[PDB]
Write a protein that binds this DNA or RNA. Structure first.
Length: 94
DNA sequence: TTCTGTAAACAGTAAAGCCGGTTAATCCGGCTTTTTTTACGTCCTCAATATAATGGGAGCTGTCACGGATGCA
């Protein structure tokens, strides 16, 4: 499982470096670096699901300024309970 | 020279934080009866009449013929 996934990861890293102006071969260093600092065991790579919901609520209350909460339920289709919890959360943070 | 293990490493089982929807729960404004109270017109109830008035039958019923009582005279 490791070889093909590592190869694709290196391909994407070098593509992103080329897009950003960095030399693609520098990606090897990057992956080597992460291969030193990310080991320890077996765990699947996902995303920031907590951060995904965090930025979702961020966008929700950035678009929210009143009645457009209904538009929020029309934006993607979500509950008013989570929207109200997110509003209270944005009130909590300063 | 031939037959054994062992550490790097990839499948597995279990559990819970979160989570993208799941349900119940209360509060502001409004229409619709639901009942109630007057207004009133209508409906219901009663009283009085001062010339004089003084006894029906109302259509009978149109007809058969047994028996068995029945109560008198």
């Amino acid at each position: 499982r490791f070889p093909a996934l590592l190869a694709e990861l290196n391909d994407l890293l070098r593509g992103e470096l080329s897009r950003l102006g960095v030399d693609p071969a520098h990606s090897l260093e990057i992956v080597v670096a992460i291969c030193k600092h990310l080991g320890g065991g077996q765990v699947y790579i996902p995303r920031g699901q907590a951060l995904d919901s965090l930025i979702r609520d961020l966008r929700i209350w950035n678009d929210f300024n009143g009645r457009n909460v209904s538009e929020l339920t029309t934006r993607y289709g979500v509950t008013f309970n989570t929207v109200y919890k997110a509003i209270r959360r944005m009130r909590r943070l300063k």
